[PDB]
Design a binder for this molecule. Structure first.
Ligand SMILES: CCCCCCCCCCCCCCCCCC(=O)OC[C@H](COP(=O)([O-])OCC(O)COP(=O)([O-])OC[C@@H](COC(=O)CCCCCCCCCCCCCCCCC)OC(=O)CCCCCCCCCCCCCCCCC)OC(=O)CCCCCCCCCCCCCCCCC
Ligand SMILES: CCCCCCCCCCCCCCCCCC(=O)OC[C@H](COP(=O)([O-])OCC(O)COP(=O)([O-])OC[C@@H](COC(=O)CCCCCCCCCCCCCCCCC)OC(=O)CCCCCCCCCCCCCCCCC)OC(=O)CCCCCCCCCCCCCCCCC
Ligand SMILES: CCCCCCCCCCCCCCCCCC(=O)OC[C@H](COP(=O)([O-])OCC(O)COP(=O)([O-])OC[C@@H](COC(=O)CCCCCCCCCCCCCCCCC)OC(=O)CCCCCCCCCCCCCCCCC)OC(=O)CCCCCCCCCCCCCCCCC
Ligand SMILES: CCCCCCCCCCCCCCCCCC(=O)OC[C@H](COP(=O)([O-])OCC(O)COP(=O)([O-])OC[C@@H](COC(=O)CCCCCCCCCCCCCCCCC)OC(=O)CCCCCCCCCCCCCCCCC)OC(=O)CCCCCCCCCCCCCCCCC
Ligand code: HEA
Ligand code: HEA
Ligand SMILES: CCCCCCCCCCCCCCCC(=O)O[C@H](COC(=O)CCCCCCC[C@@H](C)CCCCCCCCC)COP(=O)(O)O[C@H]1[C@H](O)[C@H](O)[C@H](O)[C@@H](O)[C@@H]1O
Ligand SMILES: CCCCCCCC/C=C\CCCCCCCC(=O)OC[C@H](COP(=O)(O)OCCN)OC(=O)CCCCCCCCCCCCCCC
Ligand SMILES: [Cu+2]
Ligand SMILES: [Cu+2]
Lengths: 145, 552, 109, 203, 67, 139, 92
């Protein structure tokens, strides 16, 4: 068992209260603070006409990629209707994996077209804009129910 | 093994979660946010009122606005900087973080805090409402001396609206006084005694004591003045005893009012230091006695404002004003000991704290320089006294309120500020403020007395007024970074997930989430000493925290 | 309507509530153009927040006095649910039905 | 419903607790009582000067200051203090009816104090001083008249808490409300002992 | 004196000093980290960005690509 | 508790000391006589801290050590059920509107607005204080 | 606890597709709940145009025209900010 390596401690219940050195930050997301707001807008505001928690995964997946992406769809907080996108810039692999109840809801032609609309922007060199052009496409594709 | 978070938090919030929640506030948090918002709005109103005065004083003519509008201008300005900007924010930071600091779920009378805030706002609007009146608001000063306020003199409607606006604002701040003193007395976390509470809730304990001492005499004085104006009721009659009957009990309100102004901002700054000095507050029990040692005497010091009248017992109030200057000096040298041999970083709220230290220093040197009556017999109502109360009072409320905002901002809205923009804010509210008040010492010592609308070209000293105008308009464009910083730090700006966005936080506040939950606490820490958040977040520190906490 | 009425006693308002008569009829003359916009904004978002205030009394309970949690230091408001409860600290959240839902356990039994 | 989750004695709870815990509306009204004592300090300072000013036979010629109607209504008011304290004795022991009988008669003779003070004001203004007529007449009308506003606000608190006893079960919170209004009004008629010693006896 | 000077002074020296301090303090690099260069390897911890979109395991589908 | 009684005892000692020394130093040493306007203000600020400290001493004697106030007290030693705090309430905004109407009747000397604002104060104060005591509608 | 549940089958309805979603406003099917937003943009802009037309009249006090310019520039600033944020999708 190890907490955050300096300054954190688990409280009287399971909430682990941590710190942040005073000039530093908490999230350390290596993306600008305005285009991931555009990601959250494309993934919440212009997504609610699809009725599925669009997860986005950027971490490494250095294994059998489909299995290790559908394994990490299982902790998206409702896995039966979730359209996760997984991207590994260590590995150059897009992987859009669905939930159960998202099935035949305008989705089987939207996943390869979402991968194409993402990977047309990844090869330029825009991670966030690739994710936005993928989530907008899969929002236009997944029909609500 | 990995969480499932949003990429950025909620920017604005959903449509319609605040405006009914405005009307039906009951937690201390949102009420304190409303105090900070609407009182920085009144700070904006006052700042532009001062910039109108300072356009006026830039040239010896009456070139911009009249005489009477100027006499309304400094009066409404002195009120919406003292009794409608400072006086609310001394409970606005209380409603921010005092139930967070004492472990309280809410503030003790959670409707009467909404009642305090809304009585404040609707005393403030009906006191600003003199400007709608055609003769305007009160031309007599903030001091409002009684042969000038009785209805023969300044007979307009604006003075009456001023009177009843301060009646409502005083009642609301009395009610803030009672519910803050009852929080800190009997609504408190189960492990903390009287002494290991933070210093800031201690300063608001004694500040609410002096609010209950002072402000009912403002309402009593002012109900007597409203009767003396409308009923023609001879109480403050000048050929009666009624021009020291104003001065004695009005300044018996007034100087305890300026120390209920001064003490919780001392508490803010004394909370700023131990988390940026990365160490204890130096002499914590010394501060916990020194707040009483200044504030008990604050009541009994009141007539160091009537040195010029020649009708007060003069050595008594001069000796006790030196004796109220000594415990704030104690409270100051504890702060210099708190920065002493620490690992300082001057991220922005400590930078405002240090600006407060420098301004309140040389202003308090003017305090001991001014409280001696022969050195005041030329200086009573000069510009040395107006640069004195700016160079003290601005330093207390404005610098320590910017320290309080840039410190308790990521814990009252869960998002940081821009550090660069806050440093911009500080350096051109420091350079500009010293530009507009380091010269009014030398402008009130050579002659230019207070509350004048114009002066002469055959009088000298025009250049010191124009350099005060340069400094005041540096300070007028100084809050463009501040309102831009909070405007892009609520709806945007760098979020915090974990606690302590300022590391080495302490004082029992910083042991909950940065948007704190409704009723403030999911897990209280085991309170053992004055810094229980510092003892939660650093458990290995505790034996080193106590084993060297006594030498010096 | 309140503006066109409250600037028809323009005369006696500017008489008693000491305002310039020109000033209060300009206040009306701008008010009939901008105060419907202000009250539209406040009314629309206030209706939506009144909706949200009795759409959180279903997902949560009805608010009461505070109990602390026993082994640790917490503060829960001790919500009293309106419909069927589950086995834990949250009930089955009801659906809205156009009814005035009670927000005080006072108004319950 | 299932049963409830807030299974308490009422929707209202005491204020915290009062067996090993201080009552919080109690300490709230105590410090607000102390604030209103400073308000009366403002009124007393408006009295104790403008009596050092007037010299010689200083209560002026139209002020035939009636003590024979003053000391009966002070005796009414301070006996009514003991009626209100008997009401809070019957509030600790929890019956609404022992509370309501003693607070009804406390409200009635407090109303008798307000009507006696109003008749004293009529009888002292119709052949004497007015509030723009004298210095002493004005300070007499404000130092005791706004005390009339204090006691009429206390009467509003009595009738208001009596309707509150009509509308709900007698909780320990309502005994807290009763003891709070009880010694608010005890503060009112200890300030009136101070004012009656000051205006009439000491002068 | 010389009302053009004492108006241009009080209207420009605030804006001149504002421009100087805002060009020496806002041209610094902020605390926010740099944008992710795609050619650089993924140095960051793994990131999952959920949605909270309808508020409250078995496999659905698949797709893939190689940029 | 203990320490509030000691706190207002310190304030009572200083306020009584300052009151009596201001009275006996403006009895002599002044122009006309006793000032009577900060003297009685000091005597009744002694009265303020007498009331608060005497009540806190009355409570502190008729009490054990509070499980809040006790030094070296675990949180589980004092984790019970606190009393009622009010949730959401739209009466204080009405208190302020009522008292502001009464105040602008007392400022612009409008006795109809004084009486109407006092009537709204009584109505809204009733609405605040009965808010958690109105029973259900009996039909 | 002395309460019953409430169940109301209304005539629910454009028919539940275009407008505002039930998570933007918490009850959108229960009534009309979305003004089209070009109406309020052009309403604000026409309000400010009306305040600018209000200079034309019997008029010698030019202290009023600064209030008309002010309350017109505030409304033009709010409408322009609001339209610009929807043109960029609520950014800055
Ligand atoms: C420690 C913290 C920091 C210290 C404070 C620093 C302050 C420095 C100076 C001020 C600058 C700060 C930036 C302000 C911009 C806000 C940006 C932001 O992100 O905030 C969101 C932030 C997040 O809130 P949320 O709950 O997540 O959702 C907000 C959504 O907008 C959903 O809300 P809603 O849908 O329920 O209602 C929205 C509405 C509700 O707001 C209001 O109705 C009151 C605003 C009064 C405007 C008066 C201006 C004159 O807001 C507006 O009115 C927008 C129009 C603003 C008009 C200003 C014209 C300027 C030209 O809001 C806050 O937490 C702050 C609360 C502020 C309280 C207002 C205090 C006013 C007191 C009562 C007013 C009643 C009388 C007024 C007359 C009637 C006319 C309305
Ligand atoms: C001078 C201005 C007068 C201000 C009077 C209020 C200040 C008192 C503040 C501290 C006292 C304790 C307290 O926090 O009250 C709790 C309560 C706060 O409720 P909360 O925050 O939800 O906490 C739950 C309670 O603690 C749960 O405890 P509770 O609900 O059982 O409260 C206990 C008790 C609280 O008992 C008291 O506070 C003593 C009542 C003394 C007020 C009588 C008026 C005296 C001034 C008249 C001259 C001006 O409530 C009552 O049953 C009696 C309330 C009667 C208020 C009558 C005000 C009418 C004024 C107009 C009179 C017309 C004549 C003039 C012409 O405040 C009130 O009940 C009073 C409403 C505020 C009125 C302000 C008027 C503007
Ligand atoms: C390049 C572009 C051009 C240049 C632009 C300049 C670039 C930006 C510069 C900055 C602009 C300067 C002003 C800055 C203020 C903005 C700050 C702010 O609002 O806070 C952000 C935030 C609001 O969020 P937001 O960023 O505005 O976006 C929200 C939505 O996207 C938007 O919400 P929404 O989508 O729901 O929009 C609602 C609104 C649409 O928004 C608009 O476009 C404005 C329309 C007019 C606005 C007028 C005032 C209402 C605004 C509320 C002010 C309350 C005061 O619709 C209305 O409510 C009004 C409809 C108008 C109806 C037409 C009028 C017809 C009248 C009847 C005609 C009768 C005439 C003849 C009579 C004869 C009878 C027969 O505020 C808060 O959340 C909390 C407020 C806290 C207040 C703190 C401030 C201190 C308060 C002290 C007390
Ligand atoms: C003022 C209007 C007062 C209307 C009272 C309506 C309250 C109500 O319906 O509660 C129902 C509530 C029963 O429902 P519930 O059991 O709590 O829950 C059922 C629902 O499920 C739960 O629903 P809910 O309880 O959560 O919310 C419903 C409630 C929520 O509404 C409220 O929050 C009322 C407070 C409004 C504050 C005024 C905003 C001022 C903005 C500041 C800037 C001013 C400058 O009512 C409304 O939505 C409609 C009220 C309309 C207010 C608009 C008028 C503002 C004009 C601005 C003047 C300037 O309790 C009552 O029956 C109250 C009855 C007593 C009515 C009269 C009492 C007021 C006495 C006069 C006060 C003196 C004010 C001076 C005015 C002169 C101004 C110069
Ligand atoms: C924030 C509010 C504030 C504060 C804290 C002060 C703090 C002080 N003020 Fe100021 N003052 C006003 C706001 C303040 N004042 C206002 C609003 C007015 C009236 C407005 C008007 O009339 O126009 C005013 C009017 C005023 C007067 C009125 C006389 C006149 O009208 O000309 C006097 C003199 O008696 C005065 C003296 C002081 C003193 C001695 C302190 C002392 O507390 C300061 C002491 C601080 C230092 C002394 C300590 C630190 C320095 C060293 C590190 C240690 C000590 C060294 C010494 C021993 C030499 N003030
Ligand atoms: C509480 C402390 C305080 C504060 C903060 C202020 C704010 C300022 N004061 Fe004021 N002042 C007093 C304490 C303060 N004053 C007192 C006690 C009086 C005496 C009353 C009396 O004598 O009767 C007084 C009256 C006063 C005088 C009157 C003396 C005379 O008439 O000769 C002077 C001297 O020029 C003065 C200087 C300033 C300056 C430069 C500021 C600056 O901080 C300016 C602040 C305002 C701007 C920073 C705001 C920026 C403008 C906005 C951006 C405009 C747009 C906003 C709208 C959209 C809402 N003040
Ligand atoms: C119930 C609470 C209600 C609260 C409402 C509070 C009001 C809001 C602010 C009002 C500001 C008023 C400032 C007026 C100050 C003023 O006098 O300015 C006059 C004209 O200004 C003006 O009216 C312009 C201001 C217009 C205000 C904009 C309106 C805002 C709306 C939203 C408010 C409506 C509220 C209505 C409420 C109704 C109920 C609704 C629910 C200049 O003409 P005048 O004075 O005659 O001529 C001069 C010579 O005198 C002088 O010697 C000479 O020098 C020359 O100057 C000469 O021109
Ligand atoms: C502001 C409140 C200040 C003080 C309140 C004192 C309450 C005590 C009332 C004093 C009674 C008295 O003795 O008034 C005798 C004289 C009679 O003289 P006359 O008319 O010239 O005779 C004719 C000969 N031809 O009062 C008068 O002037 C006439 C006015 C009557 C008293 C004034 C109204 C009483 C209540 C004030 C409203 C309070 C509002 C509070 C809002 C927050
Ligand atoms: Cu002073
Ligand atoms: Cu003076």
């Amino acid at each position: 068992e190890l907490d955050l390596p300096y300054g954190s401690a688990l409280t009287s219940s399971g909430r682990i209260s941590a710190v942040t050195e005073p000039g530093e930050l908490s999230v350390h997301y290596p993306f600008p603070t305005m285009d991931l707001v555009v990601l959250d807008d494309a993934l919440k505001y212009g997504s609610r006409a699809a009725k599925a928690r669009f997860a986005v995964y950027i971490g490494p997946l250095g294994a059998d990629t489909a299995a290790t992406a559908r394994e990490i769809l299982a902790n998206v907080p409702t896995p039966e209707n979730a359209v996760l996108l997984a991207v590994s810039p260590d590995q150059r692999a897009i992987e859009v994996v669905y939930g159960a109840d998202v099935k035949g809801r305008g989705i089987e032609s939207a996943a390869p077209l979402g991968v194409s609309a993402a990977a047309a922007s990844f090869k330029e060199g825009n991670l966030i804009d690739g994710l936005i052009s993928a989530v907008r496409v899969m929002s236009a594709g997944v029909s609500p129910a | 093994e990995l969480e499932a978070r949003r990429p950025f938090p909620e920017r604005m919030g959903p449509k319609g979660n605040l405006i009914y929640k405005l009307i039906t506030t009951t937690d201390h948090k949102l009420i304190g946010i409303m105090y900070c918002v609407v009182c920085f709005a009144f700070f904006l109103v006052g700042g532009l009122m001062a910039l109108f005065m300072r356009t006026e004083l830039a040239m010896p003519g009456l070139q911009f606005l009249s005489n009477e509008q100027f006499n309304q201008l400094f009066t409404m300005h002195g009120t919406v900087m003292l009794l409608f900007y400072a006086t609310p924010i001394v409970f606005g930071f209380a409603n921010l973080v005092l139930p967070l600091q004492i472990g309280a779920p809410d503030v003790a009378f959670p409707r009467l805090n909404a009642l305090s805030f809304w009585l404040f706002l609707f005393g403030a609007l009906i006191a600003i409402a003199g400007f709608i009146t055609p003769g305007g608001a009160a031309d007599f000063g903030w001091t409002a001396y009684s042969p000038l306020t009785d209805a023969i003199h300044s007979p307009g409607a604006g003075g009456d609206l001023w009177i009843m606006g301060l009646a409502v604002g005083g009642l609301g701040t009395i009610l803030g006084g009672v519910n803050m003193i009852t929080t800190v007395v009997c609504m408190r976390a189960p492990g903390m005694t009287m002494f290991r509470m933070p210093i800031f809730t201690w300063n608001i304990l004694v500040t609410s004591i002096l609010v209950l001492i002072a402000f009912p005499i403002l309402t009593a004085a002012l109900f007597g003045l409203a009767a003396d104006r409308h009923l023609g009721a001879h109480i403050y009659d000048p050929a009666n005893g009624g021009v020291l009957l104003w001065q004695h009990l009005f300044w018996f309100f007034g100087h305890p009012e300026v120390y209920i102004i001064a003490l919780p901002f001392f508490g803010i700054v004394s909370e700023i230091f131990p988390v940026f000095s990365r160490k204890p507050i130096f002499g914590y029990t010394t501060l916990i006695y020194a707040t009483l040692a200044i504030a008990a005497l604050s009541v009994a010091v009141w007539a160091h404002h009537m040195y010029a009248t020649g009708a007060v017992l003069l050595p008594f109030f001069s000796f006790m004003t030196f004796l109220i200057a000594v415990p704030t000096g104690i409270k100051f040298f504890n702060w210099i000991g708190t920065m002493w041999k620490g690992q300082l970083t001057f991220e922005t709220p400590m930078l405002f704290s240090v600006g407060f230290l420098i301004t309140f220093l040389l202003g308090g040197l003017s305090g001991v320089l001014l409280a001696s009556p022969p050195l005041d017999f030329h200086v009573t109502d000069s510009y040395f006294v107006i640069a004195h109360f700016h160079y003290v009072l601005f330093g207390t409320i404005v610098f320590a309120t910017y320290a309080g905002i840039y410190f308790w901002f990521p814990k009252m809205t869960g998002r940081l500020l821009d550090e660069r923009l806050g440093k911009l804010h500080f350096w051109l509210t420091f350079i500009g403020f010293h530009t507009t008040f380091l010269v009014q010492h030398w402008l009130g010592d050579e002659g230019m007395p207070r509350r004048y609308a114009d002066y002469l070209p055959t009088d000298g000293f025009t250049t010191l007024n124009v350099i005060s105008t340069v400094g005041a308009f540096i300070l007028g464009v100084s809050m463009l970074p501040f309102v831009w910083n909070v405007f892009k730090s609520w709806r945007y700006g760098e979020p915090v997930t974990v606690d302590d966005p300022w590391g080495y936080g302490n004082s029992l506040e910083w042991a909950t989430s940065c948007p704190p939950p409704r009723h403030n606490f999911t897990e209280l820490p085991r309170i053992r000493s004055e810094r229980p958040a510092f003892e939660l977040h650093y458990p290995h520190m505790v034996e080193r925290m106590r084993a060297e906490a006594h030498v010096g | 309507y309140l503006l066109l009425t409250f600037a028809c006693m323009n005369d006696i308002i500017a008489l008693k509530f000491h305002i310039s008569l020109n000033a209060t009829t300009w206040i009306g003359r701008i008010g009939m153009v901008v105060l419907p916009a202000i009250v539209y904004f406040v009314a629309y978002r206030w209706a939506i927040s009144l909706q949200r205030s009795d759409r959180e009394v279903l997902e949560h309970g009805v608010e009461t006095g505070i109990i602390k949690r026993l082994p640790h230091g917490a503060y829960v408001e001790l919500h009293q649910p309106l419909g069927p409860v589950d086995e834990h600290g949250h009930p089955i959240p009801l659906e809205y039905a156009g009814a005035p839902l009670p927000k005080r356990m006072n108004k319950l039994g | 419903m299932t049963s409830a989750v807030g299974t308490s004695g009422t929707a209202i709870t005491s204020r915290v607790h009062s067996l090993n815990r201080p009552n919080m509306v109690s300490v709230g009204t105590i410090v607000w009582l102390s604030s209103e004592l400073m308000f009366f300090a403002g009124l007393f300072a408006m009295y104790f000067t403008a009596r050092a000013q007037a010299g010689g036979a200083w209560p002026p010629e139209p002020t035939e200051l009636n003590l024979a109607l003053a000391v009966p209504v002070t005796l009414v008011l301070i006996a009514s203090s003991f009626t209100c304290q008997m009401g809070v004795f019957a509030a600790e022991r929890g019956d609404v009816f022992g509370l309501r009988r003693w607070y009804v008669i406390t409200f009635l003779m407090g109303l008798f104090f307000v009507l006696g003070q109003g008749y004293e004001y009529i009888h002292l203004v119709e052949h004497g001083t007015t509030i723009p007529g004298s210095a002493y007449g004005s300070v007499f009308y404000l130092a005791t008249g706004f005390h009339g506003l204090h006691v009429i606000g206390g009467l509003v608190a009595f009738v208001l808490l009596l309707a509150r006893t009509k509308m709900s079960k007698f909780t320990p919170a309502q005994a807290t409300a009763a003891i709070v209004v009880s010694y608010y009004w005890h503060f009112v008629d200890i300030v009136w002992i101070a004012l009656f010693a000051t205006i009439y006896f000491v002068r | 004196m010389s009302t053009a000077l004492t108006h241009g002074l009080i209207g420009g020296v605030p804006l001149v000093l504002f421009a100087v301090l805002a060009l020496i303090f806002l041209t610094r690099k902020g605390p926010h980290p740099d944008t992710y260069k795609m050619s650089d390897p993924w140095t960051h911890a793994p990131i999952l960005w959920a949605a909270e979109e309808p508020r409250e395991v078995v496999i659905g589908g698949g797709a893939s690509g190689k940029w | 508790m203990h320490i509030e009684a000691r706190l207002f005892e310190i304030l009572t000692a200083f306020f009584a000391l300052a009151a009596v020394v201001y009275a006996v130093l403006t009895a002599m040493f002044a122009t006309g006589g006793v000032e009577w306007a900060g003297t009685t203000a000091l005597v009744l600020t002694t009265g303020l801290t007498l009331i608060t400290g005497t009540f806190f001493r009355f409570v502190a004697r008729r009490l054990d050590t509070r499980p809040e106030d006790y030094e070296d007290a675990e949180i589980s030693d004092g984790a019970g059920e606190l009393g009622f705090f009010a949730p959401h309430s739209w009466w204080p905004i009405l208190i302020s509107l009522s008292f502001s109407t009464a105040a602008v009747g007392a400022a612009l000397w409008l006795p109809w607005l004084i009486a109407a604002g006092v009537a709204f104060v009584i109505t809204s104060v009733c609405g605040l204080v009965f808010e958690y005591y109105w029973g259900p509608e009996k039909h | 606890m002395s309460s019953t549940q409430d169940r109301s089958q209304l005539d629910p309805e454009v028919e539940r597709h275009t407008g505002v979603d039930v998570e933007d406003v918490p009850s959108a099917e229960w009534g009309w709940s979305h003004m089209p937003i070009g109406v309020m943009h052009i309403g604000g802009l026409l309000s400010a145009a009306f305040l600018l037309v209000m200079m034309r009249g019997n008029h010698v006090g030019h202290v009023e025209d600064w209030f008309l310019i002010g309350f017109a520039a505030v409304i033009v600033a709010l409408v322009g900010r609001n339209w610009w944020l929807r043109r960029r999708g609520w950014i800055r």
